[PDB]
């Protein structure tokens, strides 16, 4: 049900467990009060993860890198 | 602070050339199982 | 939460053919008569003796030459089974994360080093002379041959565990906890998380310290869940590691390290294999002559220098940084 993933920040990435199946609206906040317009989470070098999207079918699982970066205006850039 | 950088890499047949988008002041040693996932 | 691993089978690299070489002794130091000028001024002797030199010798040549093969075969082995303390990042993905069993000649010994490994090969002659003298041009050369071509050249040493009991480094604070967490990596790395434990107890664990621990299934319990990590037994305290691993105390083999140089050193044995590692402050002065079990280790600026009556036995060692080992931990907890 929890995922403990590399957070990154502007650097010093943390170490935070997650649920496996929320929408982002709220981890964004807690992220910003556990580490720290609006951020998203995604792989380094990967697009933007939908923000309600769930972290269990986009596939995320322990030990990834999930960054803290803002929303892009929509194309994917494959 | 991200840098938007090109990478090369040729080891199967010539090589493959994609650019990307890295966030900068962090150990290359995280992203290399990132590039390395994306061009391979 | 995590993927599944199948136990596909371990790849075989080209072993050793551990066997006897033999080599026959040289000629025997063949009487020459005097030349004789009145049967020497026409225009047994020296030349028949010299071809046979020249046959000796090109005969040692070709017995270098296989000695050398083999050689390459165990170095070979050797490197393949034990990798630099950086090509394991890679490893946890592929095929050969869990490649090492029970049954296979690498069980439970664990990388520290480079230096000299003395070519389990044979190597005898059979020599059957009562102080009979040999030729001295052949008799240097295959001595000249048997010191040399004896002993690998700077090959990955071992530092097994399957029969120590006990391990415990001396001298600086974190030269120590680099060939520690080097050789802990190594080793949880290469075996099946449900075959060995580890344990861990130190006051500052969580600080890019000992920390590292967080993602590891191999210091995991059966059947608890501790929230967030598999089991934490990464604590601070002694026996309250002890009774965190009494009931686990009983084979899955258990590695017991301890980051603290006093709170009650060698206080849970003295059992049947169950290791136990231990950073000391300061050496004893006159061991009675230190069981190679049980042994004592001081770590030099490349040197793992072990205690005997000082027999480097390391002459480049392998460490590891912390970072490095967050990595590991941070990689391998997916599968």
Not at chain 1, 2 to 19: D, H, K, N, S, W
Not at chain 3, 142 to 157: E, I, N, S, W, Y
Not at chain 3, 181 to 205: E, N, Y
Request: hydrophobic letters at 45%; one cysteine or more; glycine letters at 4%.
């Amino acid at each position: 049900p929890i995922v403990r993933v590399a957070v990154l920040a502007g650097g010093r990435l943390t170490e935070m467990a997650l649920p496996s199946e929320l929408p982002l609206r709220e981890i964004l906040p807690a992220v910003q009060r556990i580490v720290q317009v609006r951020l998203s989470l995604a792989p380094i070098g990967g697009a933007p993860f939908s923000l309600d999207a769930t972290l269990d079918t986009v596939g995320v699982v322990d030990g990834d890198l999930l960054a803290l970066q803002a929303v892009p205006s929509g194309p994917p850039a494959p | 602070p991200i840098v938007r950088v090109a990478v090369l890499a040729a080891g199967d047949d010539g090589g493959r050339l994609t650019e990307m988008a890295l966030p900068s002041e962090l150990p290359l040693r995280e992203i290399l199982p990132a590039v390395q996932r994306i061009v391979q | 939460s995590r993927l599944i691993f199948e136990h596909q089978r371990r790849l075989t690299p080209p072993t050793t053919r551990k066997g006897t070489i033999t080599i026959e002794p040289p000629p025997q130091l063949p009487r020459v008569v005097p030349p004789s000028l009145l049967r020497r001024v026409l225009p047994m002797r020296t030349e028949e003796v010299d071809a046979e030199r020249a046959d000796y010798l090109r005969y040692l040549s070709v017995v270098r030459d296989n000695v050398r093969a083999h050689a390459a075969e165990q170095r070979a082995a050797l490197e393949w089974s034990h990798p630099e303390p950086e090509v394991l990042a890679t490893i946890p993905g592929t095929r050969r994360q869990w490649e090492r069993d029970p049954r296979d000649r690498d069980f439970l010994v664990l990388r520290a080093g480079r230096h000299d490994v003395p070519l389990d090969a044979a190597l005898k002659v059979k020599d059957t002379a009562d102080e009979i003298d040999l030729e001295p041009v052949a008799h240097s050369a295959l001595r000249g041959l048997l010191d040399v071509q004896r002993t690998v050249r700077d090959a990955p040493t071992g530092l097994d565990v399957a029969k120590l009991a006990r391990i415990t480094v001396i001298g600086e604070a974190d030269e120590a906890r680099a060939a520690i967490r080097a050789w802990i990596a190594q080793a949880v790395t290469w075996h099946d998380p449900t075959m060995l434990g580890v344990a861990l107890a130190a006051p500052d664990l969580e600080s890019g310290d000992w920390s590292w621990l967080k993602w590891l299934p191999h210091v995991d319990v059966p059947n608890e869940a501790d929230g967030v990590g598999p089991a934490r037994y990464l604590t601070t305290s002694t026996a309250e590691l002890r009774e965190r691993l009494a009931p686990a105390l009983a084979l899955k083999h258990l590695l017991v390290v301890l980051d603290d140089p006093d709170a009650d050193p060698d206080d849970i044995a003295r059992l049947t294999g169950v290791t136990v590692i231990h950073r000391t402050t300061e050496l004893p002065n006159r061991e009675q002559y230190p069981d190679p079990e049980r042994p004592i280790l001081r770590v030099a600026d490349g040197r793992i220098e072990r205690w005997q009556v000082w027999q480097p036995c390391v002459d480049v060692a392998d460490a590891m940084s912390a970072a490095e080992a967050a990595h590991i931990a941070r990689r391998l907890s997916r599968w």
